[PDB]
Write a protein that holds these residues in place. Structure first.
Motif, PDB file in Angstrom:
ATOM      1  N   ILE A   1      37.518  69.330  72.708  1.00  0.00           N
ATOM      2  CA  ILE A   1      38.166  69.278  71.411  1.00  0.00           C
ATOM      3  C   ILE A   1      37.566  68.274  70.438  1.00  0.00           C
ATOM      4  N   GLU A   2      36.483  67.566  70.784  1.00  0.00           N
ATOM      5  CA  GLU A   2      35.993  66.537  69.867  1.00  0.00           C
ATOM      6  C   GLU A   2      35.463  67.108  68.549  1.00  0.00           C
ATOM      7  N   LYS A   3      35.178  68.409  68.467  1.00  0.00           N
ATOM      8  CA  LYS A   3      34.703  69.003  67.223  1.00  0.00           C
ATOM      9  C   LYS A   3      35.841  69.535  66.376  1.00  0.00           C
ATOM     10  N   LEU A   4      37.085  69.411  66.826  1.00  0.00           N
ATOM     11  CA  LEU A   4      38.238  69.938  66.119  1.00  0.00           C
ATOM     12  C   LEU A   4      38.898  68.832  65.314  1.00  0.00           C
ATOM     13  N   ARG A   5      38.962  69.019  63.997  1.00  0.00           N
ATOM     14  CA  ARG A   5      39.460  67.958  63.136  1.00  0.00           C
ATOM     15  C   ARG A   5      40.972  67.815  63.208  1.00  0.00           C
ATOM     16  N   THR A   6      41.709  68.918  63.362  1.00  0.00           N
ATOM     17  CA  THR A   6      43.154  68.877  63.208  1.00  0.00           C
ATOM     18  C   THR A   6      43.861  69.240  64.510  1.00  0.00           C
ATOM     19  N   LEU A   7      45.093  68.780  64.603  1.00  0.00           N
ATOM     20  CA  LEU A   7      45.914  69.162  65.748  1.00  0.00           C
ATOM     21  C   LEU A   7      46.216  70.664  65.758  1.00  0.00           C
ATOM     22  N   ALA A   8      46.336  71.287  64.585  1.00  0.00           N
ATOM     23  CA  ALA A   8      46.503  72.745  64.543  1.00  0.00           C
ATOM     24  C   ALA A   8      45.329  73.447  65.205  1.00  0.00           C
ATOM     25  N   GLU A   9      44.100  72.939  64.985  1.00  0.00           N
ATOM     26  CA  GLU A   9      42.936  73.527  65.639  1.00  0.00           C
ATOM     27  C   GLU A   9      42.957  73.292  67.148  1.00  0.00           C
ATOM     28  N   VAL A  10      43.375  72.102  67.588  1.00  0.00           N
ATOM     29  CA  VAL A  10      43.517  71.852  69.018  1.00  0.00           C
ATOM     30  C   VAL A  10      44.494  72.845  69.633  1.00  0.00           C
ATOM     31  N   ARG A  11      45.645  73.057  68.984  1.00  0.00           N
ATOM     32  CA  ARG A  11      46.623  74.013  69.498  1.00  0.00           C
ATOM     33  C   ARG A  11      46.023  75.410  69.588  1.00  0.00           C
ATOM     34  N   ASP A  12      45.282  75.813  68.556  1.00  0.00           N
ATOM     35  CA  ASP A  12      44.668  77.130  68.556  1.00  0.00           C
ATOM     36  C   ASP A  12      43.725  77.306  69.740  1.00  0.00           C
ATOM     37  N   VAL A  13      42.889  76.303  70.011  1.00  0.00           N
ATOM     38  CA  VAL A  13      41.955  76.378  71.126  1.00  0.00           C
ATOM     39  C   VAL A  13      42.697  76.380  72.455  1.00  0.00           C
ATOM     40  N   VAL A  14      43.768  75.580  72.571  1.00  0.00           N
ATOM     41  CA  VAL A  14      44.575  75.632  73.791  1.00  0.00           C
ATOM     42  C   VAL A  14      45.073  77.051  74.021  1.00  0.00           C
ATOM     43  N   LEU A  15      45.628  77.678  72.979  1.00  0.00           N
ATOM     44  CA  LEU A  15      46.181  79.028  73.122  1.00  0.00           C
ATOM     45  C   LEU A  15      45.110  80.073  73.410  1.00  0.00           C
TER      46      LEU A  15
END
Ligand SMILES: [Zn+2]
Length: 133
Positions: free
Chosen positions: A66-80
Motif C-alpha cells: 500500500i505504500e503507493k496509495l495516497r488515501t485510505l479510500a484507496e487502501v480500502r479499495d485494494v483490500v477489497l
C-alpha cells in the motif's frame, strides 16, 4: 470505521489464541490519508496488538502492498480487490501479557510483511472490540 472483534481468547495473557472477525470496513469519505504513503515499503495486514503500546505482532496474514496509495479510500479499495469481508480466523499471541482491553485483531499498516511488527499500527478508524451503541 473498520469494525473487528475477538470472540474468544484462550490460554493466558502472554500466550493466547484469539478467534477473530474483521466484520466490515465502511466507505471512506472523509479524505483520510494513508499513514504509510511514500514509505519505501508498506503492507496492510491482519495483525494483533502485541505490546501494551498497541504495536503489531506477527501478522495473521498480509493483504497487499500500500505504500503507493495516497488515501485510505484507496487502501480500502485494494483490500477489497484482494479479500472479501468478513475475514475470520485464529491467531496466537506469545509475548507481553495483555488484558482483554489490550487485546485486538484488526487491519494494521506496517513496513514488514511478517515477523514481529513494532512499527505497525492499526489503520485510522479501526474500532476494535465492542462497537458503539
Ligand atoms: Zn503477539
Amino acid at each position: 470505521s473498520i469494525f473487528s472483534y475477538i470472540t474468544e481468547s484462550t490460554g493466558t495473557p502472554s500466550n493466547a489464541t484469539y478467534t477473530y472477525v474483521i466484520e466490515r470496513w465502511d466507505p471512506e469519505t472523509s479524505g483520510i490519508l494513508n499513514p504509510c504513503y511514500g514509505w519505501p515499503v508498506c503492507y496492510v495486514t491482519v495483525n494483533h496488538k502485541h505490546t501494551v503500546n498497541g504495536t503489531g505482532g506477527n501478522p495473521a496474514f498480509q493483504i497487499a502492498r500500500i505504500e503507493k496509495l495516497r488515501t485510505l479510500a484507496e487502501v480500502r479499495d485494494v483490500v477489497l480487490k484482494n479479500r472479501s469481508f468478513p475475514i475470520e480466523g485464529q491467531t496466537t499471541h506469545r509475548g507481553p501479557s495483555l488484558n482483554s482491553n489490550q487485546e485486538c485483531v484488526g487491519l494494521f499498516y506496517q513496513p514488514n510483511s511478517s515477523g514481529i511488527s513494532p512499527r505497525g499500527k492499526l489503520l485510522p478508524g479501526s474500532l476494535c472490540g465492542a462497537h458503539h451503541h
